[PDB]
Every structure is written in C-alpha cells, then in structure tokens.
Design a binder for this molecule. Structure first.
Ligand SMILES: [K+]
Ligand SMILES: [K+]
Ligand SMILES: [K+]
Ligand SMILES: [Mg+2]
Ligand SMILES: [Mg+2]
Ligand SMILES: [Mg+2]
Ligand SMILES: [Mg+2]
Ligand SMILES: [Mg+2]
Ligand SMILES: [Mg+2]
Ligand SMILES: [Mg+2]
Ligand SMILES: [Mg+2]
Ligand SMILES: [Mg+2]
Ligand SMILES: [Mg+2]
Ligand SMILES: [Mg+2]
Ligand SMILES: [Mg+2]
Ligand SMILES: [Mg+2]
Ligand SMILES: [Mg+2]
Ligand SMILES: [Mg+2]
Ligand SMILES: [Mg+2]
Ligand SMILES: [Mg+2]
Ligand SMILES: [Mg+2]
Ligand SMILES: [Mg+2]
Lengths: 71, 39, 58, 51, 171, 110
RNA sequence: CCCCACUAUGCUUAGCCCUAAACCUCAACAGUUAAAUCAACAAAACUGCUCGCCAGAACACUACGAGCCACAGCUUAAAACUCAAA
RNA sequence: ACCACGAUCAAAAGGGACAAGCAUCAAGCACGCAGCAAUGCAGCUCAAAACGCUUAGCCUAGCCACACCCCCACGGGAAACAGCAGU
C-alpha cells in the first residue's frame, strides 16, 4: 500500500509541532491561567459541601491544598 | 459483535439530525443588507 | 411465567435437581438426574403446571 | 396428591442412585487396588535406586 | 526454614540413612543442595500439617500449598533482586492465582478453607467492588467530605443538650 | 399473609454483612431482551433482616417479605439459608458435598 | 546529500518519561479440512465461544474537559464550517 | 335514601414498575443499619452507569402536568382570555 494517509498525518503533526514551538510562550501563560481557575473551581466545590451541610466555616483545622501546582 | 456485547451496547444511537441554514424550517424572512455577485 | 424468579447454580452439588418455592412456604424438590429435558418439562407440568382446562377457562 | 407423587418419584430415583453408586465402588476399588500395586513397585524400584 | 542438616526428600526414607558417615549425611542434606530442594521439604511439612491426605497432590489444598511455597520463594528472590521485573510479574500473577484457588476452596469446602488459611497464615480478603484511580482531586474531596460529616455529627449532639436543658427548666 | 412488600419470596446471594442484623443480598432475575429475545440476568439488591447474624458473604439465602418494612430499605427477613458457603448439604441425598463430589458417601447410612 | 573535528546522547548507578510501521498491521480458547474452496491481493477456507474494537472523507496523533513526577509532554478525544467522494 | 361491617369508586401513605441523548457528567458526599429508649455501629449508591447536564408532555376509549410569575402561595411582584369570539 501507499503511505498517502501517513503523509497527511505526517504533515499535520509537523505543522502542529511547529505551531507549538512558535507559540510556546503564549501557551505557557494560558496554561498557567487555566490552572488558577482550576484551583478556584476546586476550592468552590469543597466550600459548597460544608456550606450545604450547615457549617459556616471550613472544618476545624482544614486547609484546602493546592493540587494543581508543579511543586 | 457477540450477543452479550449487543445487549450491553443496546440499540444503535443515531446522532440527532443536523439543522441546515433554515434551522429546520421551510422558509425564513430576511432583510437585504447588500447585493453582489459570486464566482 | 415472567413473574417467577428463575435462578441457576452450576456445579454446587454432585447431582442436578430443581427446587420450587411456593407462596405458602412449601418447597418442592425435583430430582432430575438421568432424566431427559422432555421428561423434566413433563414432570414439573404435572406437579405444578396448570392443566389445559384451567387455561381454557382463563 | 401431586406433592406425595413427587416425593415417591424422588424415592424411586434414590434407590436407582444407590444401586448405581454401589457398582461404582466395586470398580473404584479394583482400579485403586492396581494403582497401589503399580505405585508400590515404582516406590520399591525408586527406593532401591536411591539405596 | 528447615535446618541445613535436614536430609533431602529423596533420601529421608532409605533404610540405614542414620548410620552412614557424617560426610555422607552432609552430601545428602539441604546444605549441599540448591534452594529448590529446600522448597520441596517446606512443601512436605505444610502438607502433613494441613491436608488430610498428604499424598494427594491434585487436590485444591495441595495446589494452594505448592503455590504458597513458590510465592514465598519469589518474595525472597525479589528481596535481593528489586529490579527483576520478570519475577515481580510472576509473584503478582501467582498471588492472583492463589486468591482464585482460595475463592474456589471457600465456596466448596469451608472447613478446609479455614485450615489452609490458619496453616499457611493467609488472611483472606474480599476484592474491592470498584477499581478506580484515587487521584488528587478525589483524595482531597473525600477527606473533606469525611471532615464535614464528623463536624455535622458533633453539632447535632450539641443541639440535643441545649434542647434537653431548656426542657428541664420549664419544669 | 397479606403484605405491603412486592417481592414475597426471592432467592439471592449474600454480598454484605457489615450492617448490624442486616444482610445485603443480590437477587438476580431473568429479563428478556426484546430485540435479541435472549434472557440476561438482571440483579437487584435487597436488605434482609438477620436477627442472629448467621449469614455469611457468598451463601444462598431465601428471603421472606415482612408484613411492613422495618426500615427504609429493609423489606425482607432471612427465611432460610439454602446453600451455606463452602458447607453445602446435598438436598437430594442429605449428605455433605464439596462441589460435585460427596464428602460422605450416601452408602454410609445406606 | 560528500569529507574532517567535536558535544548532547548511546554506557553505569538512582529516579522519571510511557511513546513506535510496539506490525508476524492477522485477539484468546476449542475444533474441522467436507460441503458452496474462494471478490482481489496477501500468509487456503471455515466452525463454536468470549472479550476488545469499527460505522463516508477531511477537520483530527486537533480543540476543550479530566488524569498523570509528564509543563514545547502523554492518555482519552469532539464539534462547527467543507466535500461527493475518500 | 338512612345502616350495608358489604359493593362500587378512588385520595394520601407503603412496596414494585416506568422516556431519550451525553461517561469529555465517574465518583455521589450522609446518600445506611441496629435499639423501647439512651445510644451504638459505619455504613449506603455506583462502569450491570450512581451523581450530574441537556432534550421532550405521555404508553392517546385517554392520561399526566400546569392554570400570569416567585416549583408551593401565608406573603410578595403585580392586576393576568393557555374559556368562547376577537385584537
Ligand atoms: K501504538
Ligand atoms: K511489520
Ligand atoms: K407553576
Ligand atoms: Mg511498493
Ligand atoms: Mg493537513
Ligand atoms: Mg560524549
Ligand atoms: Mg557494557
Ligand atoms: Mg518489534
Ligand atoms: Mg495494532
Ligand atoms: Mg484477549
Ligand atoms: Mg486454534
Ligand atoms: Mg468517520
Ligand atoms: Mg503520536
Ligand atoms: Mg494532544
Ligand atoms: Mg488540554
Ligand atoms: Mg397514591
Ligand atoms: Mg409509589
Ligand atoms: Mg470536551
Ligand atoms: Mg417543553
Ligand atoms: Mg395569559
Ligand atoms: Mg402557581
Ligand atoms: Mg381564545
């Protein structure tokens, strides 16, 4: 068989990798912002729980950890 | 597929029919903005 | 008999048997070892199946 | 009457089972006798080789 | 482990083995043999200690005992060879096959299942119903939901005493 | 004899004993697949009152409906342990068995 | 593309990463060689049973979401517009 | 007619059953049990699809739901044809 289908995929992946290289600094700023919103969306999910259970503050001694940071 | 697989998958789910430029309607009213020619 | 629970059990005992649980609480043990499938169907029809008259009436 | 007839059919099948099981023990014992003989020779042969 | 002076399973029942020279006893002992010979002696001890017929090797009991000896050999092997991925696979597969044997023995002969567990020191465990990744977001939310439950329980008990106290005052 | 519970007699397998005096029982029924016209097991969970806590996970039990439910999910009581897990008694002969093999021969008591 | 020099790298140790035309592109178990042998080519045609997967092309080994020691990554993976073919 | 220890009819309550699409909605977060109570145990649902989002009146001798909105209607917004004819 010919490799014409492979050749299409080859070009797509090449142009994709090149696009990522050309915009890797903008993508890093966007990725950082998404992780911040992801952490906020996570904190809201937990706060909803204790508030809907009748508590007014977080359980004594509870600190929501940062589960999306590289550290 | 096997009978167990066909039972587990169920009947085939066919995607809801797409709506064309009329949004599933025979005609639409419009206001002309500009006229031109296309090749 | 869509409303009768039928449950199957493999290789739990040395010989095959059918057991029926009735609403009164009575249990009917039917030994089926050595019997053909047609004889099993005729046996349980006789002891626990509705006769042709009872069905004609319904 | 049908429950009693079914209980009698089970008793009949039980007597046929016990007769079938007795014939299987006599055959099982014959085989079990030969295997012990064969197994005893293989032990004596294996024991002599080790000795 | 059996003492090194233990004789091989093949030479333990030959007549007159106790009157031979000490050198001949060393040459027919575990000290002068490979580890596989020591595992055959371990398998024999477990059989007499557990199974009703120590000569029946095809029973589900004997297979569980044989596989348990292999499992212990893999664990000792991997204690010294921690990057041996081939034997790590054999251990995990063997543990899964003993659980599959123990399941079938528990379903068929519970009295024998109990003696196998006591004799071999196996703590039978029922499988978990759901195997799913406990990722960070799940492990944190589940922890918070347990803390919220514990706090709600405490508050509900302090709403029993205050109501109890006020009711007594009316009297 | 009347009861408000729909399922009057059901057989199932005990799958849980972590509740006090309550056995969690998986009951399977055959349900016809309308398109394939093949029967497939459909399983449902029932809580059964077990006063003596004699049920073990894996044994086949017979459940009887209560006159009225005793709890939100407890609508049945343990009526009989049909097949004790690993301790099955052959109903046809009355002798103990381990799978398809007898542990005591029926010829012992003739 | 050809010649020379030299580095990351190929090696060891301790951790990661988890991708290949990872393809013998031919799933596991059991069975058959008779009937119709059989689109073509390839590595002859089939049966039982089970799981996995597939449903025009392209968009797309992409977007978003989610998970991940991965932060120019991997896994899962669409839709709109477009074509009457591929 | 009134009574029928009843029949018919049919609420509430209890048990069971009961739409479609999406798993890129995979976890839900108290969803269980025992006890006369006190209280104790830590369970309950879920890849055989829970929880969630979106779409839709339905299984048509008819049925369900709604009746301007705030699911409800003390109260409030506000002043109501989704009764007929009509605009
Ligand atoms: K691949
Ligand atoms: K290849
Ligand atoms: K309303
Ligand atoms: Mg070529
Ligand atoms: Mg392209
Ligand atoms: Mg170098
Ligand atoms: Mg080297
Ligand atoms: Mg290769
Ligand atoms: Mg492949
Ligand atoms: Mg496979
Ligand atoms: Mg084959
Ligand atoms: Mg396609
Ligand atoms: Mg790739
Ligand atoms: Mg990607
Ligand atoms: Mg992304
Ligand atoms: Mg009602
Ligand atoms: Mg109801
Ligand atoms: Mg998406
Ligand atoms: Mg609507
Ligand atoms: Mg109006
Ligand atoms: Mg209203
Ligand atoms: Mg009108």
């Amino acid at each position: 068989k010919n490799v014409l289908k492979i050749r299409r995929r080859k070009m797509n992946h090449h142009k994709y990798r090149k696009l990522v290289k050309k915009t890797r600094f903008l993508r890093r700023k966007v990725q950082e912002g998404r992780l911040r919103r992801k952490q906020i969306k996570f904190e809201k999910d937990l706060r909803r729980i204790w508030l809907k259970a009748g508590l007014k503050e977080a359980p004594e001694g509870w600190q929501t950890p940062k589960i999306y940071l590289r550290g | 597929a096997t009978l167990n697989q066909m039972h587990r998958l169920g009947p085939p789910k066919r995607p809801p029919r797409k709506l064309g430029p009329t949004e599933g309607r025979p005609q639409l009213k419009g206001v002309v903005l500009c006229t031109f020619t296309r090749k | 008999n869509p409303w009768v629970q039928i449950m199957m059990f493999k290789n739990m005992t040395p010989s095959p048997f059918l057991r029926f649980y009735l609403d009164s609480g009575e249990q009917v043990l039917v030994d089926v070892e050595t019997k053909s499938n047609k004889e099993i169907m005729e046996h349980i029809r006789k002891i626990l199946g509705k006769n042709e008259e009872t069905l004609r009436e319904e | 009457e049908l429950m009693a007839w079914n209980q009698a059919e089970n008793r009949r099948l039980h007597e046929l089972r016990i007769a079938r099981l007795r014939q299987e023990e006599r055959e099982q014992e014959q085989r079990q006798a030969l295997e012990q003989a064969r197994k005893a020779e293989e032990v004596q042969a294996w024991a002599q080789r080790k000795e | 482990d059996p003492p090194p002076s233990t004789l091989l399973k093949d030479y333990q029942n030959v007549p007159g083995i106790e009157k031979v020279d000490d050198v001949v006893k060393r040459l027919l002992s575990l000290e002068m043999a490979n580890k596989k010979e020591m595992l055959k002696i371990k398998q024999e001890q477990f059989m007499k200690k557990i199974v009703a017929n120590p000569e029946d090797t095809r029973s589900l009991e004997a297979r569980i005992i044989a596989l348990s000896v292999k499992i212990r050999s893999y664990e000792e092997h991997l204690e010294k060879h921690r990057k041996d991925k081939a034997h790590k696979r054999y251990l995990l597969m063997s543990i899964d096959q003993r659980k599959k044997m123990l399941k079938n023995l528990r379903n068929t002969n519970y009295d024998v299942f109990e003696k196998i567990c006591w004799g071999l020191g196996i703590e039978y465990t029922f499988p978990p119903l759901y195997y799913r990744r406990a990722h960070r977001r799940f492990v944190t939310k589940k922890a918070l939901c347990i803390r919220v439950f514990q706090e709600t329980q405490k508050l509900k008990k302090r709403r029993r005493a205050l109501k109890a106290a006020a009711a007594a005052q009316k009297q | 004899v009347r009861s408000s519970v729909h399922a009057r007699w059901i057989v199932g397998k005990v799958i849980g004993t972590k509740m006090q005096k309550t056995a969690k029982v998986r009951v399977t029924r055959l349900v016809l697949d309308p398109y394939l016209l093949k029967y497939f097991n459909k399983r449902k969970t029932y809580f059964a009152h077990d006063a003596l806590q004699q049920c073990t996970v894996g044994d086949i039990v017979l459940l009887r409906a209560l006159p009225v439910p005793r709890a939100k999910h407890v609508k049945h009581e343990l009526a009989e342990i049909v097949f004790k897990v690993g301790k099955v008694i052959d109903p046809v002969t009355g002798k103990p068995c381990a799978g398809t093999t007898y542990l005591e021969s029926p010829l012992s008591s003739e």
